[PDB]
Design an enzyme around this catalytic site. Structure first.
Site, PDB file in Angstrom:
ATOM      1  N   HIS A 251       0.829  -1.198   0.000  1.00 47.36           N
ATOM      2  CA  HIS A 251       0.000   0.000   0.000  1.00 47.36           C
ATOM      3  C   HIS A 251       0.867   1.251   0.000  1.00 47.36           C
ATOM      4  CE1 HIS A 251      -4.167   1.667   1.300  1.00 47.36           C
ATOM      5  NE2 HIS A 251      -3.493   2.606   0.640  1.00 47.36           N
TER       6      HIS A 251
ATOM      7  N   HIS B 236       2.045   4.905  -1.572  1.00 41.86           N
ATOM      8  CA  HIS B 236       1.641   6.095  -2.327  1.00 41.86           C
ATOM      9  C   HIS B 236       2.982   6.700  -2.715  1.00 41.86           C
ATOM     10  CE1 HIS B 236      -2.690   7.041  -1.552  1.00 41.86           C
ATOM     11  NE2 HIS B 236      -2.510   6.102  -0.648  1.00 41.86           N
TER      12      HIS B 236
ATOM     13  N   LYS C 218      -5.830   0.032  -8.997  1.00 43.06           N
ATOM     14  CA  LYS C 218      -6.429   0.533  -7.773  1.00 43.06           C
ATOM     15  C   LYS C 218      -7.786   1.168  -8.054  1.00 43.06           C
ATOM     16  CE  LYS C 218      -6.947   2.183  -3.544  1.00 43.06           C
ATOM     17  NZ  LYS C 218      -5.866   3.018  -3.016  1.00 43.06           N
TER      18      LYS C 218
ATOM     19  N   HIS D 178     -10.409   3.460  -6.427  1.00 41.25           N
ATOM     20  CA  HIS D 178     -10.477   4.387  -5.310  1.00 41.25           C
ATOM     21  C   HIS D 178     -11.728   5.249  -5.401  1.00 41.25           C
ATOM     22  CE1 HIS D 178      -9.130   7.295  -2.328  1.00 41.25           C
ATOM     23  NE2 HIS D 178      -8.056   6.560  -2.109  1.00 41.25           N
TER      24      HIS D 178
ATOM     25  N   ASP E 249     -12.195   8.278  -4.545  1.00 45.79           N
ATOM     26  CA  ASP E 249     -11.877   9.641  -4.981  1.00 45.79           C
ATOM     27  C   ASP E 249     -11.965   9.770  -6.501  1.00 45.79           C
ATOM     28  OD1 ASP E 249     -11.453   9.899  -2.290  1.00 45.79           O
ATOM     29  OD2 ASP E 249      -9.466  10.822  -2.451  1.00 45.79           O
TER      30      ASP E 249
ATOM     31  N   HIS F 150     -10.709   0.485  -2.494  1.00 51.63           N
ATOM     32  CA  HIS F 150     -10.990   1.477  -1.469  1.00 51.63           C
ATOM     33  C   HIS F 150     -12.407   1.820  -1.903  1.00 51.63           C
ATOM     34  CE1 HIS F 150     -10.333   5.663   0.528  1.00 51.63           C
ATOM     35  NE2 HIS F 150     -11.625   5.423   0.377  1.00 51.63           N
TER      36      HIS F 150
ATOM     37  N   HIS G 292      -7.139  -1.266   3.838  1.00 52.60           N
ATOM     38  CA  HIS G 292      -7.648  -0.771   5.123  1.00 52.60           C
ATOM     39  C   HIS G 292      -9.082  -1.184   5.402  1.00 52.60           C
ATOM     40  CE1 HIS G 292      -9.436   2.026   2.369  1.00 52.60           C
ATOM     41  NE2 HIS G 292      -8.259   2.513   2.036  1.00 52.60           N
TER      42      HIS G 292
ATOM     43  N   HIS H  56      -7.307  13.530   2.026  1.00 51.13           N
ATOM     44  CA  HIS H  56      -8.323  13.488   0.977  1.00 51.13           C
ATOM     45  C   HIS H  56      -8.792  14.821   0.396  1.00 51.13           C
ATOM     46  CE1 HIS H  56      -8.439   9.157   1.312  1.00 51.13           C
ATOM     47  NE2 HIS H  56      -8.576   9.277   2.619  1.00 51.13           N
TER      48      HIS H  56
ATOM     49  N   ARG I 244     -15.962   7.979   9.327  1.00 48.43           N
ATOM     50  CA  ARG I 244     -14.898   7.009   9.064  1.00 48.43           C
ATOM     51  C   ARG I 244     -14.115   6.635  10.316  1.00 48.43           C
ATOM     52  NH1 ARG I 244     -11.850   8.724   3.494  1.00 48.43           N
ATOM     53  NH2 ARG I 244     -10.113   7.784   4.652  1.00 48.43           N
TER      54      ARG I 244
ATOM     55  N   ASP J 142       0.215   2.688   3.875  1.00 43.87           N
ATOM     56  CA  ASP J 142      -0.673   3.706   3.288  1.00 43.87           C
ATOM     57  C   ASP J 142       0.195   4.968   3.403  1.00 43.87           C
ATOM     58  OD1 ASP J 142      -2.786   5.126   2.153  1.00 43.87           O
ATOM     59  OD2 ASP J 142      -4.191   4.813   3.789  1.00 43.87           O
TER      60      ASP J 142
END
Ligand code: NI
Ligand code: NI
Ligand code: NI
Ligand code: NI
Ligand code: NI
Ligand code: NI
EC number: 3.5.1.5
Lengths: 566, 101, 100, 566, 566, 100
Positions: free
Chosen positions: A133, A135, A216, A218, A220, A245, A271, A319, A335, A359
């Protein structure tokens, strides 16, 4: 002759029956087996055993190993044993008894003129960690992770850009190509994840053909049933993994809708507890399914007194949420739940959650994957006692269950277990040597592909390597062409066939991913539990078979203030 | 004790020995200062300096290498010149010779 | 100054020691890195003063006591080693079991 | 015209007859000759000499040098002279008089449009040092040595591994190949040593064919008569050098047995005094033989008040010895003798010991080879006065004898004198510029292959390069492809012929070693003495022709506390 | 629906009519146009607009951009507008409205699966700066300049050598080749200048054929009429630029003689004010001619209370002058004039001086080109008020005039405007993102060729990228092969044709210079004034059309003590 | 903080000066690097205070005297130069023969 057990331990490290405390935790491991022949142990140094005609033989390079780790205490998913480790051609050659067959008995690892020696007596040796994970917000993360004992990094990103700050995605052929080229400069094995959020299959196939080993999905970028179905369809045809996600907002549906969209196809849920993202408040119920490979990110591991307090603002920055926009703060709060955060720790202890990850810089700490995994094990032993699987007066089984979380399981999940993930013959020699007092915190040596890549090093001008200041510095395995030879860049089968490595002129060794579609929960080593888990929509209480799952927050943790300057 | 100190023996160094020299009176007729380097071909200096350019042909200032002589506006002074050596070929400056002599 | 790599490296040790020094002053029990840095920096200054290697090997064992550091720390430091420019050049000072 | 001598010295540096103090020592050098024509010195700057048509000519690049060091005071084994140095194609073109033949007399070094200028007036220029006792424990050692003025490093190792911690050995083809590749990343010339401890010739030939330029025989791997004979046999057939660290334990025989095993064949004896290793207590008697090229490692140079005290624990860590094991401490103590340590300094002054080296991080200081060599010269002048060879009221001869110890002699010993080792035409332009006040301590400029590789550099954003903080930083000669072009990787003749450079895809310039078997003690420049030396087995007293050789320990040394921050 | 203007600005950045203060100066810019459709702005993040089927479309990589900078406030020579910026293949694709054509109107920049996102709302985006007066004294200058917002560096040098300390010259084929190879290691676009001081054309042609994109004529190498004529003749035939530092000493003639030697041919005059070098005291009169492209170096920008005091010693060190030699100090003083230093600032405000540059570590600060340019603009607004060209109640025109000085004008002057210099379609994507409070001082992101190369980065192990300490660190665009792909090495047309890139095996992208002979003062964007300027030989007073030009020295400046730690 | 390379570089100078400051306080005669760092750091703070370049060029010659440094040190430092952010931007301070 005869020698006392204590004197023996001081010279060659512990043997069968001896126990060792892991750092400053309450976890104790007991040596299960010793592959040596007492009296025939190999030791290097002035007037020792590894010398011409003695512990070192007359064989040519082809008939002896390049490197031998003497008297190592191995801790891996398959056992906690004392043995010598032989490395040849950058790979694990054998685990057994090293020496010279000319004068010594039971030698399975021949030492010759071409053999280098690493003295591991009194040290614990483990496989290099695998963080799935990542980034790619900055290249400096690689050194941080390597220093912590992580040798493989899977994730996505293009640098400090908004898209990468929030998601593990390397968008499109151009960026993928660029990041594959940049990867040659990093001292860790690397595999990239592309952006899987699209309802047009060809836009995904292009990315896979360009080089990503996974996609991935996601929220977003829109974690809708249509996007999810599309990504899984392509994954099924190209043998790559999908990381999810989910839709926290429940905008397109609830958790049951997402699960329905997945339709029993293999998928890695990031997660799974939810704080890092996912259907509020029940994304954690995913760990009950056979096709779901569930992992945790690290800031919620383990549950401590300061956990909740630090989460809100961390969530916001990660985010790009606006604290002045009510809807933005409401979804951030939904969350963060004490109930699911506390249950997560127990679910790991039970084997319901199978992996730990970071993450990195997007609600996670890149250098704390290993450290936090052991802190959870410690807190669980303290609270729940021995596992039902334990045998003997030790924590051997709990240790095997937890080490699997950041080694073999991440490897299986992402289709790279044929190359790395454990100390088994034929796998890349990515090894980490630890002194028991610093296990899981600060490594003594980090080996990449058969060469030491980073290690603590004292005064460069000193008469010996030990004088202060001692801090981690890059070694030969992290330099230019030697690095390329000791690291792997993972590609999809399609990219490998398309000649992507030749086209981009990649210098490092190439490995291909495979078996991403066939892995299931039952394949996770020591972590295959599929509990009948439920989450109360109103109270957020987590229950397994009706019983409430929970734990208490730690006020103080091991592997913390005793080891760090800041 | 002074680290890296020199112990220069007393005396003097005779420069450009065994070479033809000549003295010339020069006057700056310009309104701005002019400074000439030790190895510049004197006959091709700034046109505002008035002197016998014909006498200075193939000559440079007879001063230590790297030093210079400054002429403030209206300043008049006598300088000593020393003849060029080597191939005695002049290239550059104001492009007046661009060849041997 | 023309600082060589080793001189700059020692600046890192000096600074780490400043951190520990302030914490000890607050009355905190020092951890592993703080203890190593404090004792090491002490030795470097001893060499600058012109003390002998023999004297420092002894004095270094009296900088911190078991009651000024966290539990387990004394056992994590079987010895401390550091080099510095003595009046007679670079020398290595090894202090065995510095914390008791 | 005329100019006073002092004013002259201030502008162009000293000339014939002037003396200069070396740093803060008691050593003074006197300019022996000046190759200039007074009045025709070249100087660069605003309104100076090096300008079009003046000190700079009209020739094409092919007819002028690429770089000229103006008004340099050269200190080399052949002389201490004032002259201009011309560099062309990365090599020393000429030592003479620079300028433009069109208007200047006696020009031997033509300056044209293609010529860069380094102003050396008031500076001392020497060849780059050569350290032949490197333990490749970490890559950071290269920068440390380069900063000290050492441009060539010969040794062995694979990183911070037990074998390398103790010995200068790069074991086998795989590690040798890996280290040859890593070498391209380092800004110094490099040659590797393989493990010579084997009684099977083919195991040695493989290593030589893989790329090593020498073989290290070390007692930790078994320095037995059989291993020694084997290594020398192979060395004799492949034209490579053997470096020896003998049997301290006298386990296989005494010093006379080892010498007998060598059988008059050429060999380089490491740390001949013994503290760093060797037959106790008489390994020092090796310097009497014609086939032995003897060197010293640096912690015993020079004998000071704190020398003995620091040695015991240094010894232990370097050889993985156990202080609790009586036999381990007894053999450590038998290596540390005040008697041989004091005699060593005198033997260097007499020319009986011919080389100085470090023994980097394995009982030696990588950045102190040059510095300690001069401290010995200083201490010897102070104690013994002028050498019998001195002429005039200066220390010119002693200076030539000592500079040869870390420049030309190490080059001859290892078969690389055709490429480096001194300031002579045709050799690689590895030069070091020093300000007299910092001679031997902190260089003003370090040139590798014709390009500046490292130098002190002030504030990067400053209006000039001099503002604080000023510290050593890598320059263009240490960057990527420019570095490859300015450094050399030495290979054995066999490796060169086998196409090892092409196979490993080495990027740097390649040089081959030769003449390792034909060098003898008589070939060591200014250090060819073969004394009738004896060591008393009981008292350890060293005697030459019956007279006792000894010296007094220094309480304070030059090139120490006046220059270093720590 | 409806939204208030303030709330709008807080979410998407300012729009038409809103004004923004540049850092802590008195300069205000007003948004002139906004290319968006209100309500259709794209925003990325949790639950935002850029998601599958919404703001992100279904197109393949070929039909969408690789990178989009959302809601950027562009400040360039052509306008100050609000818009989205699309980048494709490392180049500027479009300036317009980004999104998904499937559901959004007026989309000119399509966002798809292959698109990465950089959120620029509330930020100012500009082209990367271009410094054409670099002295390659050390490689560290590249990082310093990049961090300041400069992405292209043109100059000459070989490292910390006397010639380079004083002049921007890379002498001859060997050094030029070496520096071209070293350039691949630097994260900025690079073009080199050779030594133009020779009266033999072939010696210049060789250098151009070797790779230089220009020739520097410097007085330290002899700035005589013959050398000047020779360099210009070659420049005219090979399409390269000439940079001049004239004869301060008036040794070969006065300014009128140099101008006569130039004979109306195109030439770039360095530090035209004179302090950095040039005919004393009237070199500044060169800005009146149509063939002269005049620039300033930065230490004299702007005129402040401490300016004069710091100049003398700076001058001396930069030109290797001796303070004890009267003639050396007299010529240093004749270069420092309060009169011309004060007038220079006004001449910039009027557009008579067209470029700003550094003169790195040779009487100039490499990291202060942009910063000082804005300080001059501020000081000029404060003293002279609005420019005659201003429209509206803002400083938009003055801002466009000044930004052109370090962006498009240097590009035009050196024949590289076809590749870089401004934010226009088809040009390399070298962009700098700034937060208004730090405009011109500390960038938020520096993009090279479509990849982020350097940016402020917080704690590597932190849960987010923002925690302290935050300092500039190299990103993926500055790593190995990715760097090569994102940077340009400029070559002369002759070198490109000769296959120099192939011969030296240059790895970076190559660009060729062209149009160096055809540019004239009238072509300098917003800075084409040719004033009837005179300098009084006795008083040094500068007059334009008889009126005295002067200004007052600042005691305090913006972009200073509020932002820097030291 | 967004520290640029030059700001971080100056932190090295500041720290080197802390070392010298403590040694001078003990009554030791400063060596070459310690002297350069101490005087340099002094100037940087002067600029932060808002002192002029002219004032600092003078004041810098009164930080250390010949009796506070080791023999030969004054001759090893013919001048000291350092830049800092004055109220009017970066300026260079050159102190000739700082130690007398
Ligand atoms: Ni997530
Ligand atoms: Ni994430
Ligand atoms: Ni040895
Ligand atoms: Ni050694
Ligand atoms: Ni100039
Ligand atoms: Ni310049």
């Amino acid at each position: 002759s005869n020698i006392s057990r204590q004197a023996y331990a001081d010279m060659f490290g512990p043997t069968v029956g001896d126990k060792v405390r892991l750092a400053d935790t309450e976890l104790w491991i007991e040596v299960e087996d010793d592959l040596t022949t007492y009296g025939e142990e190999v030791k290097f140094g002035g007037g020792k055993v590894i010398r011409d005609g003695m512990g070192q033989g007359q064989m040519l390079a082809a008939d002896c190993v390049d490197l031998v780790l003497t008297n190592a205490l191995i801790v891996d998913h398959w056992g906690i044993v004392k043995a010598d480790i032989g490395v040849k051609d950058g790979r694990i050659f054998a685990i057994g008894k090293a020496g010279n067959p000319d004068i010594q008995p039971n030698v399975t690892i021949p030492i010759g003129a071409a053999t280098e020696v690493i003295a591991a007596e009194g040290k614990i040796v483990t496989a290099g960690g695998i963080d799935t994970h990542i980034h790619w917000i900055c290249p400096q993360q690689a050194e941080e992770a390597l220093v912590s004992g992580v040798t493989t990094m899977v994730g996505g990103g293009t640098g400090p850009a908004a898209g990468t700050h929030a998601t593990t995605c390397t968008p499109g052929p151009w960026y993928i190509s660029r990041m594959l080229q940049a990867a040659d400069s990093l001292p860790v094995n690397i595999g990239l994840l592309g952006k899987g959020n699209v309802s047009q299959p060809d836009a995904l196939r292009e990315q896979v053909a360009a080089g990503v080993i996974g996609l991935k999905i996601h929220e977003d970028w829109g974690a809708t049933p249509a996007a999810i179905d599309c990504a899984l369809t392509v994954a099924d045809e190209m043998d790559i993994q999908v990381a999810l996600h989910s839709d926290t907002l429940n905008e397109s549906g609830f958790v049951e809708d997402t699960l329905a969209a997945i339709g029993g196809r293999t998928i890695h849920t990031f997660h799974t507890e939810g704080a890092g993202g996912g259907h509020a408040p029940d994304i954690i119920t995913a760990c009950a399914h056979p096709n779901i490979l569930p992992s945790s990110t690290n800031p919620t591991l383990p549950y401590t007194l300061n956990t909740i307090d630090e989460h809100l603002d961390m969530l916001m920055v990660a985010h790009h949420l606006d604290p002045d926009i009510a809807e933005d703060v409401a979804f951030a709060e939904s969350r963060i739940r004490r109930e699911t955060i506390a249950a997560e720790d127990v679910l790991h202890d039970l084997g319901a959650f199978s992996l730990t990850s970071s993450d990195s810089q997007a609600m996670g700490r890149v250098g704390e994957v290993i450290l936090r995994t052991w802190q959870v094990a410690h807190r669980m032993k303290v609270q729940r006692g021995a596992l039902a699987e334990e045998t003997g007066d030790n924590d051997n089984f709990r240790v095997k269950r937890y080490i699997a979380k950041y080694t073999i399981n991440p490897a299986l999940t992402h289709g790279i277990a044929h190359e790395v993930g454990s100390i088994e013959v034929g796998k890349l020699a990515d090894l980490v040597v630890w002194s028991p007092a610093f296990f899981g915190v600060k490594p003594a040596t980090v080996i990449k592909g058969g060469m030491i890549a980073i290690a603590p090093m004292g005064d460069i001008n000193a008469s010996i390597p030990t004088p202060q200041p001692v801090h981690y510095r890059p070694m030969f395995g992290a330099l230019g062409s030697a690095r390329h030879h000791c690291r792997l860049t993972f590609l999809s089968q399609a990219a490998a066939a398309n000649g992507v490595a030749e086209r981009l002129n990649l210098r490092s060794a190439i490995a291909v991913v495979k078996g991403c579609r066939t892995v299931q929960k039952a394949d996770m080593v020591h972590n295959s539990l599929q509990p009948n888990i439920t989450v109360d929509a109103q109270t957020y209480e987590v229950r397994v078979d009706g019983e409430l799952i929970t734990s208490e927050p730690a006020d103080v943790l091991p592997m913390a203030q005793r080891y760090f300057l800041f | 004790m002074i680290p890296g100190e020199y112990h220069v023996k007393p005396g003097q160094i005779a420069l450009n020995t065994g070479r033809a020299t000549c003295r010339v009176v020069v006057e700056n007729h310009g309104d701005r200062p002019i400074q000439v380097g030790s190895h510049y071909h004197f006959a091709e200096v700034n046109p505002a300096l008035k002197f016998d350019r014909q006498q200075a042909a193939g000559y440079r200032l007879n001063i230590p290498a790297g030093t210079a002589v400054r002429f403030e506006p209206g300043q008049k002074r006598e300088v000593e010149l020393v003849a060029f050596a080597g191939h005695r070929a002049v290239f550059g400056f104001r492009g007046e010779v661009m060849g041997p002599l | 100054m023309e600082l060589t790599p080793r001189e700059k490296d020692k600046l890192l040790l000096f600074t780490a020691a400043l951190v520990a020094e302030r914490r000890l002053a607050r009355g905190l029990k020092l951890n592993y890195p703080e203890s190593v840095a404090l004792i090491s920096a002490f030795i470097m200054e001893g060499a600058r003063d012109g003390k002998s290697v023999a004297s420092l090997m002894e004095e270094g064992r009296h900088v911190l006591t078991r009651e000024q550091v966290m539990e387990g720390v004394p056992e994590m430091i079987p010895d401390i080693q550091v080099e510095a420019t003595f009046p007679d050049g670079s020398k290595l000072v090894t202090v065995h079991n510095p914390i008791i």
